[PDB]
Ligand binder design. Structure first.
Ligand code: SF4
Ligand code: SF4
Ligand SMILES: [Mg+2]
Ligand SMILES: [Mg+2]
Ligand SMILES: [Mg+2]
Lengths: 287, 289, 289, 289
């Protein structure tokens, strides 16, 4: 029973670093895992491979003309703990949709039997900033059943988490896409955990883990590796094992209940992220 | 002589706040301006209208028909300096295309006569992060002739500027969509201005204005207004006026020259945005070494 | 019973702002309070007087000849909630001892009957980075019997908290000086509450209150006033009222048990303030690894 | 001709890091340097010695019983480039004076013959926050002719630089103590470089060098070393060399011109560090609008 998961979140909150660290922890737990990158704005395999930038399917397509000309050897590389790594390749700037690329790639792996192994998990690393048809393609085509959202106590991070839930709600009726949990990439802020726990509560889900900020992540990042690999004894390592072990044991798969912009702002203000609004100063000149 | 302009850039660097502030400067200078928010996940008109969120074209279409049903009066609101304000609205989570929404909005506004009315400038506030077919829709359909790029001295904001320039290069043989300059939104970091100037020379453009950080910006955003409106005497207010001025007189429209990822890494690593790599230590564990 | 208190801690963590907000909360609870400024690098009475820089006893005495020509009225002002405010004035650069100016202030206040019987609290706002002889004067001279340490999760603020504790141990069996509690000035950090509680655990004291980081404090600071006065219906206001009340009902005075530098580092590493060291690569050049 | 210098500056701005990387660049250039640490809150020698904590004169003397039965080998350690490293030790918490232990350390080093013929520089690393008599001890005793003030474009760092400048003025005629320049220790901020030069112009001095923020410094420090030793190929290394070279070549030893607090505020404001004071809201309640 291979589990088809995806990680969704906006960019610039460390979504990909967490994806790779968690996956490494799976490999260290003796799970066989594939990472499929579906994010143009981040490398989703660099830390597993030790590479700078894996060649994507989209740019290897030009090398021979079409994806039917491609060998699976060129696209799918093995790295740490024999984690299987692939990068779809983002759209050509101005002349491409991101759904089409991710379809192209997922069917290529299907045709070539990448999904035909003793594979325990596949994790699609997906950009979930602006949740259009394109980035919602793994959901729509039912290519990921278990969605995890990487977010944080930042406004836009939680907005993204809310739209991602909405996107899910769309194709919930159709296919078995569910929300597995929220993952908090800490910003080393106070009450951030509680914030996301309360957001989870309202979404009808769970904060499956709080991922702290810890310099050992960056120290592993310099060496193009995960923390699991770099330093198994780091206290950060137990943090990714906890997340990983919780995903494995996870049986909580819901249809989320998105929230309103006021219902959100209410959260922000409750946990001291946003301040209580004051209309007496609204529209009022300094003179 | 209406000039159709777009501001492209990524989220989280205050693109919209610069657009609103810029536009308030123009109105204060006596120009008539319309703003078409084409950024999902951004309130592009909130400072002009003193509103928490404008009604978006896409969300009122949720009723039925982004045409007919929708009335320009329920779409287009005037605000500070008689600035006309429109919010296209983002795509339906999971289903719709963002560019399809934007064009529909723009088509609606054409079809309802908004682009008359004695307009000196219209500004499209467009998301330009992952510049897909979607967000390059206003370029392909030549809905904006001049493109300004909001960027900061940050990896991703500079990679977006790059992808925005590739998208302009893709359609420069079709239409007359040209890059007008980079606007740098400060992160209050050393050497940021030099960084962007270097990006400009490579992209084949100019850093048209350096927009400093200043608490008077947030102070005005809190009150849901621009600095130009909140305190025109402020020093930050003079900066937005200078931006507005250089845009009015801007005579430089170019086909940019996108750089390669190595050339981009070369540039970060000059200004220390990226660290120099010690590749001897790559793949090495804490125990080994 | 006029409780003779002192706030100690290093600069740059908002010690003073907490003191004044705290003392504002006491004077709103109908208390009679005197703040004596014993910190050269902080205006300890600015927010109470709505004043830029209160004139110090050392400044005034020089423009007079001596502390004997000095009138009480130029040196002790009443502010919000009729709080009495005094500023000792730090040492003359290069010559004077921070302590000597403090003792002059205290003797002048004692000489001129500034310490009234009705008074419910005196707070000394004392610098507490380097806990030398000069800055431990209140404690040596038995003027400060109840010490509150304003700290935070940054190393120097905690090291300083430990050094102020060692200062207390010295005079605890000469006079009745006791540590009353730690006061966390939050840097909007994760686990910072748990850190100071665990520091207090080791010291024998308690973390009496955690003061949040809230922008209304800054909004109030800017207007040279406390949150108690600026906006009583603010949530931060309730946070100072909490602190003040806990202070009012505090019966836990103790002799602290300072900790080894090894123990301190054990705490910072456990709460992520210090990094776990990679001792193998110590002293190694990047060329040799 | 040995040159007796001193690095004054406030805590927490990486003064001692700059000191040690500076001496490394002097040593790389074949100069004989001794670092004498006079900071209670900092290791002035750890990066040279690759050691967690050098034993101080205070504690070593505390062990023996007096400083007359203390051997030179015990305190004076050699490190990278055979830089001589010494640590005065801070004051006995609550009782001690910081100037007592520094005069002690200097007399010992004198008698034991640590100040050798071959030595080209000695540097005292003194905490320069509150410039009392005790911390001005190297100046008063005329043990430091050249003073370099580390600072940054921040209120309190510039204030401390100001107070140090008054400390020099005081003993300027008596001794031969001059100010040699400011060293800006970057916080990666805009206009900070323009600010410290402007301060320098008001003190009647110069900015000798602007030290960038660069992660390599922390990469070196984690391994308990200077950049010069970590990686002499890094752009930072050259920065420490430029600083060191300019110091070697420096011919600008002045008596400073300290500025008023108002003058310092005018500088902060001119370079966007402070906002202009809105006196129209000082005293004013939130509800009072
Ligand atoms: S559907 Fe989304 S990814 Fe595809 S072109 Fe439109 S905006 Fe871009
Ligand atoms: S006791 Fe403290 S304040 Fe007094 S001179 Fe010595 S170091 Fe300075
Ligand atoms: Mg090791
Ligand atoms: Mg007396
Ligand atoms: Mg190397």
């Amino acid at each position: 029973a291979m589990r088809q998961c995806a990680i969704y979140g906006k960019g610039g909150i460390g979504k990909s670093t967490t994806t790779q660290n968690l996956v490494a922890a799976l490999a260290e737990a003796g799970k066989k895992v594939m990472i499929v990158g579906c994010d143009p704005k981040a490398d989703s395999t660099r830390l597993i491979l030790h590479s700078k930038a894996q060649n994507t399917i989209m740019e290897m397509a030009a090398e021979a003309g079409t994806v039917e000309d491609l060998e699976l050897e060129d696209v799918l590389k093995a790295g740490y703990g024999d984690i299987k790594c692939v990068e779809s390749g983002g759209p050509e700037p101005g002349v491409g949709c991101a759904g089409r690329g991710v379809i192209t790639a997922i069917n290529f792996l299907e045709e070539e039997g990448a999904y035909e192994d003793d594979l325990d998990f596949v994790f699609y690393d997906v950009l979930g900033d602006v949740v259009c048809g394109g980035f919602a393609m793994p959901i729509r085509e039912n290519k990921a059943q278990e969605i995890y959202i990487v977010c944080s106590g930042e406004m836009m991070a939680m907005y993204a988490a809310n739209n991602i839930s909405k996107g899910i709600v769309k194709y919930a009726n159709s296919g078995g896409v569910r929300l597995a949990g929220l993952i908090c990439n800490s910003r080393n802020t106070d009450r951030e955990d509680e914030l996301i726990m309360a957001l989870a509560e309202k979404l009808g889900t769970q904060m499956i883990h709080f991922v702290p900020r810890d310099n050992v992540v960056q120290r592993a990042e310099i060496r193009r590796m995960t923390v699991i690999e770099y330093d198994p004894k780091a206290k950060q390592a137990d943090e990714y094992r906890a997340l990983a072990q919780k995903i494995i044991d996870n049986k909580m798969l819901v249809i989320p209940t998105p929230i309103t912009m006021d219902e959100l702002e209410e959260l922000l203000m409750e946990f001291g992220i946003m301040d209580e609004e004051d209309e007496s100063i609204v529209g009022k000149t300094a003179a």
